[PDB]
Amino acid sequence: IRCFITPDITSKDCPNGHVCYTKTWCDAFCSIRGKRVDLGCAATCPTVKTGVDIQCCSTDNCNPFPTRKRP
Amino acid sequence: IRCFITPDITSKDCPNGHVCYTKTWCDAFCSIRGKRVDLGCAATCPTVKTGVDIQCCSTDNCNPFPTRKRP
Amino acid sequence: SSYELTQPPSVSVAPGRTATITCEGDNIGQQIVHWYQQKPGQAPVAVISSDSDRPSGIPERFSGSNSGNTATLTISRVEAGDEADYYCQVWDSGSDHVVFGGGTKVTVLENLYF
Amino acid sequence: SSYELTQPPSVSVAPGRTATITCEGDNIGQQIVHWYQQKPGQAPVAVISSDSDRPSGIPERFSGSNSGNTATLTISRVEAGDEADYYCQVWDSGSDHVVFGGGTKVTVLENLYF
Amino acid sequence: QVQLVQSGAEVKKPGSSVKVSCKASGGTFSSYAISWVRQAPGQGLEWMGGIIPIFGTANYAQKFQGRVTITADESTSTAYMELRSLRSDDTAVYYCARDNLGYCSGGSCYSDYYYYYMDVWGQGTLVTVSS
Amino acid sequence: QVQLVQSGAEVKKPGSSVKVSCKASGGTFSSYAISWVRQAPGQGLEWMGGIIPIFGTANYAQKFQGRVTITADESTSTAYMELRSLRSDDTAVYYCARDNLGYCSGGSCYSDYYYYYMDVWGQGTLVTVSS
Ligand SMILES: [Cl-]
Ligand SMILES: [Cl-]
Ligand SMILES: [Cl-]
Ligand code: NA
Ligand code: NA
């Protein structure tokens, strides 16, 4: 599967992967810089701890980097 | 000292205190709702954990509730 | 001047199959999308919050996603009782407006096609 | 069009007393204010970040506050070498601009007044 | 669970005004925002506006700004929507609805506003406009 | 520690243009933003603009928008400021300066831009405009 990967924010081929993922959470600068975003590929949807959100998807490049919309 | 206090965001007298404080940190909704803000009074400036910011001041009502400026 | 959400007015789904309801907007993946179920003559009920979370009580066969220009409500193993209108919803912070999609009416057929 | 920061051009301080430098703006308490020191013919140096934090190496006698319509740089027990220009700075997300105040020259007097 | 109870149906002449009440029962009235959402007959949902009582701040849809006022009475845990210069296509069922994400909790409050999903809905109020 | 090394002084005619370079010696050039800040003789600091290479997005002060271009060459860790239609009050020392708050770290990146304080400064480049 092809997925976007942080920190390069480029699409990489993950020949043995099955899902792309988008992990997001707030650090101390979340108000001014938005959520931290971790993009990657995995064989299965990774687990995350409380306060962290994850979305997994199963098509090439389905995890584009989500920028915050600027009012 | 008179200080603003959360969660009512009203001023009250703290006859034993000498500083007002503004304590701010990010929870998981920091990007959309801003930092959480705790206003109170104390006899001395409190200590806070990593990730938490605190500002203390020593004149009446010197800790007004800081809202986020909306572009 | 305000952000717009486009939903198909109607979806037909065979019983037991999967219903896919889309909600499109320019880079809606940057928005947080919520979904409400509303049956005739009743008040709306939230069935998905924050793109993909299920409020307590909502059946697991409801799921949501949001990426790029499309958010999706998926109802798996659909039942007659899931017949209803479904609305997507965002808060558009640039215009300080809550925006609703036009709603999608899900009709559940009596019979499989084949 | 863009957010304005107002600094007094000059401040006089007796040696070992407290220098206070203000930076005023419409509800500047909503902004994150940074402070730079600059000596003649040299590049600027950050001395306060984020209202009140000191970058590593900066002496403790530099402190900052920010509330309401005024942010303040305080230099306690000031020393001759603290004579310099001081600039406040914010990022104005409404106009996508870094804004500098006009700078304040702190002059450390040779003699106490009385 | 908290409940929202609205006033009864109203028949109004074109050009007049209507005021609908929304009484909340329990969980911290000040810290939860309340929105008004209407539904014309057979049509979709449309946000009128809302109010965050702790900040005294109301937000309206541009289509109604200048015609509508939303208020909250903290001493009676009651929200109101008044809609002026009524016309035929203001005929609708009007709901009040609570913002799920409270603005204060555990001694602290959020510092910006953002309307989250709407968890508790009133029963609705039918307003028809006719001569 | 990271260092920013700028190109040398320039003398330019009115109406011409200048291009100043800023070479960042140190690992992570992509993840940190770079600003250009000038100082006219005897005057204060003025931001020209900045660039965030990992997003390929530049931002300019309105006084210079349309007259200035800021770029970053990632293979050479070099940032550039091009300022056109030069006039006499463009005579100044021009600094490049790094935004202290990196955009990526530990496998994740921030999702919005916001210029923080500037921690590393280049030595400055004197640009003089005259005939
Ligand atoms: Cl985790
Ligand atoms: Cl923004
Ligand atoms: Cl910003
Ligand atoms: Na599903
Ligand atoms: Na001090």
Numbering used by the authors:
A (entry chain A), B (entry chain B): 1 to 71
C (entry chain M), D (entry chain D): 0 to 9, 11 to 95, 95A, 95B, 96 to 107, 1001 to 1005
E (entry chain I), F (entry chain C): 1 to 52, 52A, 53 to 82, 82A, 82B, 82C, 83 to 100, 100A, ...
The authors write:
Here, we use a panel of human monoclonal antibodies with neutralizing activity to long-chain α-neurotoxins (LNTxs) to investigate pH-dependent antigen binding. To establish the molecular basis for pH-dependent antigen binding in these antibodies, we determined at five different pHs the crystal structures of two neutralizing antibodies (A01 and D11) with different pH-dependent binding affinities to LNTxs from the elapids Naja kaouthia and Bungarus multicinctus. Collectively, these results provide a basis for the neutralization of LNTxs by the A01 and D11 mAbs by receptor mimicry, thereby inhibiting toxin interactions with the nAChR through the heavy-chain CDR-H3 loop.
To understand the molecular mechanism for pH-dependent antigen binding by A01, we determined the crystal structure of the A01 antibody in a complex with α-cobratoxin at different pHs. Accordingly, we determined the high-resolution structures of the A01 mAb produced as a single-chain variable fragment (scFv) in a complex with α-cobratoxin at pH 6.0, pH 5.5, and pH 4.5 at 1.49 Å, 1.60 Å, and 1.55 Å resolution, respectively. An SGGS hairpin in the CDR-H3 protrudes between finger I and finger II of α-cobratoxin and is stabilized by a disulfide bond between Cys100CDR-H3 and Cys100eCDR-H3, facilitating a hydrogen bond between the backbone of Gly100cCDR-H3 in the hairpin with Thr6 in finger I. The binding is further stabilized by the formation of a short β-sheet interaction between the backbone carbonyl and amide of Cys100eCDR-H3 and Val37. Further analysis reveals the presence of additional hydrogen bonds, cation–π interactions, and a charged hydrogen bond (salt bridge) with the side chains of residues Arg33 and Arg36 on finger II, which occupy the center of the paratope. The A01 light-chain stabilizes a cation-π interaction between the side chains of Tyr100iCDR-H3 and Arg70 on the C-terminal tail of α-cobratoxin. This interaction is facilitated by a hydrogen bond and salt-bridge interaction with the carboxyl group of Asp95aCDR-L3. Furthermore, there were no histidine residues in the binding interface between A01 and α-cobratoxin, indicating that pH-dependency is not coupled through the direct interactions of histidine residues in the paratope or epitope. While the interactions facilitated by Asp95aCDR-L3 and α-cobratoxin are equivalent at pH 6.0, pH 5.5, and pH 4.5, Asp95aCDR-L3 is present in the light chains of chain-shuffled mAbs A04 and G09. Our simulations indicate that the conserved histidine residue in the CDR-L1 loop of both mAbs (His34CDR-L1) has a higher probability of protonation at pH 5.5 in A01 (protonation probability: 0.59) than D11 (protonation probability: ∼0.00). Protonation of His34CDR-L1 in A01 was accompanied by a significantly increased water molecule network around the histidine imidazole group, which enables the paratope to adopt a greater number of conformational states that are unfavorable for antigen binding at pH 5.5 compared to pH 7.5 (c also).
